[PDB]
Enzyme design. Sequence first.
Site, PDB file in Angstrom:
ATOM      1  N   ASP A 180       0.800  -1.216   0.000  1.00 54.22           N
ATOM      2  CA  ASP A 180       0.000   0.000   0.000  1.00 54.22           C
ATOM      3  C   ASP A 180       0.829   1.261   0.000  1.00 54.22           C
ATOM      4  O   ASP A 180       1.880   1.333   0.673  1.00 54.22           O
ATOM      5  CB  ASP A 180      -0.839   0.008   1.310  1.00 54.22           C
ATOM      6  CG  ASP A 180      -1.654   1.265   1.468  1.00 54.22           C
ATOM      7  OD1 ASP A 180      -2.617   1.442   0.671  1.00 54.22           O
ATOM      8  OD2 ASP A 180      -1.345   2.091   2.352  1.00 54.22           O
ATOM      9  N   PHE A 181       0.351   2.277  -0.747  1.00 60.28           N
ATOM     10  CA  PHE A 181       1.024   3.586  -0.763  1.00 60.28           C
ATOM     11  C   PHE A 181       2.514   3.449  -0.874  1.00 60.28           C
ATOM     12  O   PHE A 181       3.284   4.047  -0.107  1.00 60.28           O
ATOM     13  CB  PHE A 181       0.612   4.362   0.520  1.00 60.28           C
ATOM     14  CG  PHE A 181       0.811   5.829   0.434  1.00 60.28           C
ATOM     15  CD1 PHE A 181       0.110   6.588  -0.504  1.00 60.28           C
ATOM     16  CD2 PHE A 181       1.675   6.467   1.288  1.00 60.28           C
ATOM     17  CE1 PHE A 181       0.290   7.987  -0.597  1.00 60.28           C
ATOM     18  CE2 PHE A 181       1.879   7.844   1.224  1.00 60.28           C
ATOM     19  CZ  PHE A 181       1.198   8.615   0.286  1.00 60.28           C
ATOM     20  N   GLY A 184       5.123   6.094  -0.776  1.00 58.53           N
ATOM     21  CA  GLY A 184       5.467   6.634   0.540  1.00 58.53           C
ATOM     22  C   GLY A 184       6.889   6.316   0.995  1.00 58.53           C
ATOM     23  O   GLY A 184       7.358   6.937   1.973  1.00 58.53           O
ATOM     24  N   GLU A 205       1.509  -0.666  -4.997  1.00 59.70           N
ATOM     25  CA  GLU A 205       0.659   0.429  -5.435  1.00 59.70           C
ATOM     26  C   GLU A 205       1.520   1.679  -5.493  1.00 59.70           C
ATOM     27  O   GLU A 205       1.734   2.326  -4.458  1.00 59.70           O
ATOM     28  CB  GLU A 205      -0.473   0.648  -4.442  1.00 59.70           C
ATOM     29  CG  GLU A 205      -1.396   1.802  -4.897  1.00 59.70           C
ATOM     30  CD  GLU A 205      -2.055   2.539  -3.768  1.00 59.70           C
ATOM     31  OE1 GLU A 205      -1.716   2.347  -2.607  1.00 59.70           O
ATOM     32  OE2 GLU A 205      -2.948   3.370  -4.056  1.00 59.70           O
ATOM     33  N   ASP A 291     -10.085   2.189  -4.360  1.00 59.08           N
ATOM     34  CA  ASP A 291      -9.818   3.632  -4.350  1.00 59.08           C
ATOM     35  C   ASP A 291     -10.373   4.273  -5.609  1.00 59.08           C
ATOM     36  O   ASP A 291     -11.074   5.285  -5.536  1.00 59.08           O
ATOM     37  CB  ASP A 291      -8.315   3.954  -4.325  1.00 59.08           C
ATOM     38  CG  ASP A 291      -7.601   3.464  -3.075  1.00 59.08           C
ATOM     39  OD1 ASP A 291      -8.029   3.788  -1.947  1.00 59.08           O
ATOM     40  OD2 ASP A 291      -6.591   2.760  -3.251  1.00 59.08           O
TER      41      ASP A 291
HETATM   42 CA    CA Z   1       6.606   8.056   3.851  1.00 59.66          CA
END
Ligand code: CA
Length: 404
Positions: A180-181, A184, A205, A291
């Site tokens: 996820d993410f 990041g 992702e 999403d």
């Molecule tokens: Ca981060």
Amino acid sequence: HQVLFQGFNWESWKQSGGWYNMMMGKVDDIAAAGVTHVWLPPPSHSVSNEGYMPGRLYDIDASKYGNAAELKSLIGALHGKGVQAIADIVINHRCADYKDSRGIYCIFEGGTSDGRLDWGPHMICRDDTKYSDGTANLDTGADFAAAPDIDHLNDRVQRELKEWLLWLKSDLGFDAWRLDFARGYSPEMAKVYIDGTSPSLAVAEVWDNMATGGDGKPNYDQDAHRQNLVNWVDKVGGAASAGMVFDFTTKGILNAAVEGELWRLIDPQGKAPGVMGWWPAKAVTFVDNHDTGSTQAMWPFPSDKVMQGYAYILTHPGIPCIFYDHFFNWGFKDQIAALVAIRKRNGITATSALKILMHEGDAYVAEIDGKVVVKIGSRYDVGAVIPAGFVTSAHGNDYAVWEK
Ligand SMILES: [Ca+2]
Ligand SMILES: [Ca+2]
Ligand SMILES: [Ca+2]
């Protein structure tokens, strides 16, 4: 043969009696449709109901989706039909259960009686100043605003998150990860987790915005967008790595292309325009997820053309991912299973060869491995471009397939 399936949506946590319990009755149909891997939601305690603000990573019993017993029963049922379970791994950020002397929630709790994952503010990216104590490294990727971002360069963080991931495999039965993410943190940090836990695959992702023109439509050229995705895969270890990416480039292009602009489905070199056209073995294609679609609807596929999206991804190279709602709720079950059966019957895989035969506004026609031809679009007649020897197979609203 490889076909993924997202086994939840944004409303799943609300399911009366529990989402995993409900899914038990869906396993046989998913396996019979030719699915090889089911992506399940974040399984741990989370401040938000859907699972994306995890706190006590080992506290599986606190999930709204169901407890550890219910999850293990579902994973065992998937395994009984030969289908793998992919866990949604949310590690970019994390919520801390307790406050420190500053009154800030930055003292974490892993959910076990010992100190595993019971981090402090030294483990929070220093630039996430709302929570950090200024001592950590800078974030290796983007920030998630609603919760502390974790400093993946911290050695204790790396070791204890790898221990937790290995426990999800050994204790719960998960086989693979969905990251996820992933924008990041860096792909170099993702590599630490993937290489250290040997998942059967790790689909990340990595979602960047797509370049648009003044009329609001995506640009025909999305090379920069797919270049960033292939660079992420190179940095995670490339072909050697179990890592791969969702093909958001194809999603953005296909969203627009089906609106009478199917000329968007080929680049100037004759290849598919998304990650599918440059590194299909590493491209997980999809029509919508929780999403982009579902009740969040951030970037939904045109609703009246969703089967054209499936006719495209289920017959083409790349690894397709079917979305729960489309298979079970929209009435497309039989049509989607028929398309996967065509894929399996003809031995089509992520690296199958793609020859595009027509790419006009209302007609896209392509040939895969010299065995399958598919057409999408509203054009009535594309007969002259179908090669000899092909016989009609599955069809529906604005899509048709032929097999040779
Ligand atoms: Ca981060
Ligand atoms: Ca603890
Ligand atoms: Ca943050």
